[PDB]
């Protein structure tokens, strides 16, 4: 606590609330033949985590009509899926 | 930076409406009363600003 450790001026504030699961756009699109996302059949899409919600993020740029059923999604992702055909459904 | 009963006193910074602190070391030696200044906070800028608390 005196050799390069302490004497440093911080505090911040520790919280840690909700961590979402990144679902790379290229996972849905690109490959695969749309076997529906939903919330059970997507466990086999190498996105098995449990205990936390699911987030949709945009990384792969490719035109294809697919439908997405996650828990939350990003603006860009929504203006990316529908722009190519589909619908992102969020919990009520 | 010793602070004691001696002369000069670290004076705060206030504003009408605005909320900003210049933090300027003054003194009570000669003229010590008219500590009225002008410092533009993060509002519309250009505002009646004194450091007299």
């Amino acid at each position: 606590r005196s050799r390069l450790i302490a004497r440093l001026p911080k505090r911040g504030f520790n919280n840690v609330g909700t961590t979402y699961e990144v679902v790379k756009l290229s996972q849905l699109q690109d490959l695969e033949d749309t076997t529906f996302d939903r919330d059970t059949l997507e466990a086999y899409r190498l996105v098995r985590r449990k205990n936390r919600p699911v987030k949709l993020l945009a990384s792969g740029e490719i035109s294809r009509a697919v439908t997405v059923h996650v828990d939350a999604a990003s603006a860009a992702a929504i203006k990316a899926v529908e722009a190519a055909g589909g619908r992102v459904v969020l919990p009520e | 930076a010793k602070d004691g009963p001696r002369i000069i006193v670290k004076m705060e910074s206030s504003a009408g409406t605005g909320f900003y602190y210049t933090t300027t070391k003054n003194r009570r030696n000669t003229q010590a009363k008219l500590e009225l200044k002008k410092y533009d906070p993060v509002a519309k800028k250009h505002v009646v600003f004194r450091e007299k608390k």
């Binding site: 390069l4 450790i5 440093l8 001026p9 911080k10 504030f13 520790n14 | 930076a1 070391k25």
Partner: protein, 59 residues
């Protein structure tokens, strides 16, 4: 040691020290100009090793 958790040294992509400026902030201040608003970032290429070894796992 849990202190390391709220101490500027977070785990970044590469894996180096996230530091700030421990020059002068609260107590004792009232000289210079932007020396106060100098709350940027810090990086050391000689004490990373011996530093992340108390927080690397709990990234």
């Amino acid at each position: 040691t849990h202190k390391m958790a709220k101490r500027r040294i977070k785990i970044t992509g590469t894996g180096k020290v996230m530091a700030f400026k421990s020059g002068k902030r609260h107590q004792n201040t009232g000289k210079s100009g932007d020396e106060i608003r100098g709350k940027g970032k810090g990086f050391v290429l000689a004490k990373a090793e011996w530093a992340r070894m108390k927080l690397m796992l709990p990234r």
